[PDB]
């Protein structure tokens, strides 16, 4: 099976026996795909373990994938598991559950019910700058994905349920940050991905990758707490109370984790650059004179914002990898892929791979300029994928994460602390991170 | 009147305006004449009343950006008013305030990347057709009216791009479409209509509820029965796609409203297109070189006559280059305007609630305080070499700021493929009858006196 891409006479680096090219991992998934993606060119093709990965940097190929063929070829990403009861996720459901749940949470971020969520969010924008304040008028560097991950734990929490608990040493922050572990070195995640093949013996031996007591404390939550849980209600008076709870799961996951790590890497440039924070400054109190409180349409005005936020979701995609597994011999592009093959889009080596983009190791938020942004290519820069199964909360962070940097900039500026990490050094582990947490100073204006 | 003396308070300069039609006589030579001697008389800013509406013209590129980009959405929102229009009023270009800004966010994913990306092969059909019905009026020798081929192609890209329906069979030269959208408007300033209705702007409400419209009933039902026509669909997602599925679903698009966006994309696609590809054939057959320089570059890029991508009409320098200065010689805009919503004072100039801010395009394109020799059509100062010495706020043919124009790319697209696959094939020559110099309307819109009539001959 480690003959494939010799057949399709597909290069990529050689495989080991049973491993495949695993080994590879050691710098991680960024480093590998950017060492192959100069090797190799523009098609390539690896193993991780038994599973062949034909990784595609084609625009057009790419736009097949995501967009085209995607209902009918490309429809699941990689299997897996063990994951229980998870199996009913949107993000791990597969064919017809996948459509049936895709649809039915589509209406949590339509342009009225994301418009309901902004007077429940300006509550915690206040207590946010209240409790840097407060680490601001003394001299402490501040872990900023701490103060960003609270933020981010109640903003969800709200805007899916309701509830004021969050904003210190919160129970849902403390579960849901070792809710998964990635940790390539780990045995477990290195062999049941490698030699996949005993992933039936834990699944009908009700073993499962996620924590057992993580697991009961967000299934007994959801089932004590119109949002994102009276959409799902309506509908259930097929949808059964075990695949509710791994909706909520996936949401508070997504909307404390994803946030909170983007906003240190947002924080992490303005402090690296700080004519891109004066500048951003002067644009905030423009739209908003006298710290007036932002709302649904100021955000969206702002265009140096969104150059921002766009500008540093390419240098740190949070993904890394876009993957389809193709389910049917297929013919894409002039290019022949079986069945069983994931085809795998590297997101983080497009992002910087010099045909695309001029000087991309270096921080520039003018390539999202109105006049520079036709020269983007919508199938390269892909920070929230592509096609019909996309990052569904895209609308709903992208607005979550500009009104935090909008009500932050308005009275506190952030300069390095020494101690912060220059450069800022991505985890070679597994998930995107940084090594050390960002600190930085926070002044008061 | 009491209007007529606000620049004197304010100290701003201007031509002494006439009792009811204020300065509105020495339009005689058009409104770029005007523009031109007013910027030679006075300076930086001038001011001059259109009847009893004052107008005060801006030439500084921070005063300009202010206007159009920073104070867009807070005071400098909308246009001159326009009527009467009746539901006409409706359209993305004469809405106002919310209405303007729920269909500018409505109509922006019409013109994306990937959209635009989905059009060459669509585009790429009519481009032979344009090539057949070219190489006819060149197997004979006669001159060819390039208005006339130019808009039967800017036609059927904008009716199957925006729509999917293909109304121009390989011409089909009478179409109904072309002849009715011809003449949906023609600003002509020595018809009485268009000149008493802004001596007497108090009829505009009287003309509406008489149900008069600027544009012709005949070419409104024509337009309107045709969206109506094309509404069934029972395709990918298009301009009708965009306007229906919102429609199916505040809330929402009309039926009234979704054909008043119709027939502006109808006239901008045909009108805008045929025009400047007139005025870029008419420098490239007066200047050899440039053509000849042109060719050598599309052939480099394209070679053995290979169909035109979306990648290779970007990689084109020269073509972008020729492109640009022919907008800069022949802005078809010529003005930009923006109406004062409030007491402002922008760069250190107060403006005061109701007057017209207006930006002299035309003019500010050939101040030699800003180019060398702006008479003559050299396409070099476009080059990737000495971009560095022009302003984005001196040369706006698409305008600025977030009311510029929706279909710039989209424009820029079309004439640039059109451009391809003709100089692919054909090379333009005068012959005479040919208007040299080419003398522009001294009338309302920037049109040539002449038609413009070339001698085709081929490769
Ligand atoms: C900066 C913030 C975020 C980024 C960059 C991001 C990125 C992504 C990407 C790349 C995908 C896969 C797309 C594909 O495979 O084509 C995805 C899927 C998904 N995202 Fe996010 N995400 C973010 C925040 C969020 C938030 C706040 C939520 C809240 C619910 C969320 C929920 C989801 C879900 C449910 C899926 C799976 C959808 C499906 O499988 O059909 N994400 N995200
Ligand atoms: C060479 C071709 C074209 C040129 C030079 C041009 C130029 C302009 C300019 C200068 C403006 C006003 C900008 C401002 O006031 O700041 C405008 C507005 C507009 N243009 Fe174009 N245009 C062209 C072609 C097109 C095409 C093909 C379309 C197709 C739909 C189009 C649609 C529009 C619309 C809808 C507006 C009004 C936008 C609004 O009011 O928000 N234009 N154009
Ligand atoms: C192997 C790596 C480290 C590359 O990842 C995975 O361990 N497993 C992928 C699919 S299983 C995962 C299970 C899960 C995790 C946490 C909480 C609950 C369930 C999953 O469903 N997470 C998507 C939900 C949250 C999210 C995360 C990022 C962006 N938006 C949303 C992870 C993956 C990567 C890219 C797209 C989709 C899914
Ligand atoms: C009368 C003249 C031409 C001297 O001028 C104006 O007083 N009327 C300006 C704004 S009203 C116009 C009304 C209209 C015309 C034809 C059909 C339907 C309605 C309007 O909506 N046209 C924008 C739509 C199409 C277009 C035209 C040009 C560039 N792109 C797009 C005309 C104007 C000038 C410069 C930029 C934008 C508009």
Not at 321 to 331: G, I, T
Request: charged share 25%; with cysteine.
């Amino acid at each position: 099976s480690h003959g494939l891409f010799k057949k399709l006479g597909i290069p990529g680096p050689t495989p080991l026996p049973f491993l495949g090219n695993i080994l590879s991992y050691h710098k991680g998934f960024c480093m590998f795909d950017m060492e192959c993606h100069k090797k190799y060119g523009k098609v390539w093709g690896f193993y991780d373990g038994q599973q062949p990965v034909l990784a595609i940097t084609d625009p057009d190929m790419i736009k097949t994938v995501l967009v085209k063929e995607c209902y009918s070829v490309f429809t699941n990403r990689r299997p897996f598991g063990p994951v229980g009861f998870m199996k009913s996720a949107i993000s791990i459901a597969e064919d017809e559950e996948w459509k049936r749940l895709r649809s039915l949470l589509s209406p949590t971020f339509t342009s009225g019910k994301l418009k309901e969520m902004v007077p429940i969010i300006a509550q915690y924008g206040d207590v946010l700058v209240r409790n840097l304040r407060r680490e601001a008028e003394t001299g402490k560097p501040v872990t900023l994905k701490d103060v960003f991950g609270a933020y981010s734990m109640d903003v969800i929490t709200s805007t899916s349920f309701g509830v004021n608990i969050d904003s210190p040493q919160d129970p849902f922050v403390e579960n849901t940050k070792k809710l998964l572990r990635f940790d390539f070195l780990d045995p477990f995640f290195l062999s049941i991905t490698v030699f996949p093949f005993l992933i039936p013996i834990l699944e009908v031996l009700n073993i499962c990758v996620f924590p057992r007591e993580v697991t009961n404390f967000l299934r007994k939550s959801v089932k004590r707490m119109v949002d994102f849980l009276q959409l799902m209600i309506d509908s259930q008076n097929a949808l059964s109370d075990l695949e509710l709870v791994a909706q909520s799961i996936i949401f508070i996951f997504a909307g404390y984790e994803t946030t909170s790590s983007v906003l240190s890497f947002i924080m992490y440039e303005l402090a690296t650059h700080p004519d891109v924070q004066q500048k951003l400054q002067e644009e905030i109190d423009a739209v908003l004179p006298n710290k007036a409180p932002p709302t649904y349409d100021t955000v969206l005005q702002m265009e140096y914002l969104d150059m921002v936020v766009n500008e540093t979701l390419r240098l740190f995609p949070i993904a890394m990898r876009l993957e389809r597994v193709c389910k049917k011999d297929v013919e894409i592009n002039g290019m022949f892929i079986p069945k069983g093959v994931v085809v795998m889009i590297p997101s983080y080596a497009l992002h910087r791979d010099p045909k695309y983009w001029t000087e991309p190791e270096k921080f520039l938020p003018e390539r999202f300029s109105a006049k520079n942004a036709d020269n983007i290519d919508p199938y390269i820069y892909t920070p929230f994928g592509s096609g019909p199964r996309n990052c569904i909360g895209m609308r709903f962070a992208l607005m979550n994460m500009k009104l935090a940097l909008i009500r932050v900039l308005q009275n506190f500026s952030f300069k390095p602390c020494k101690e912060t990490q220059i450069p800022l050094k991505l985890s070679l582990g597994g998930l995107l991170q940084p090594e050390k947490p960002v600190v930085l100073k926070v002044e008061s204006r």
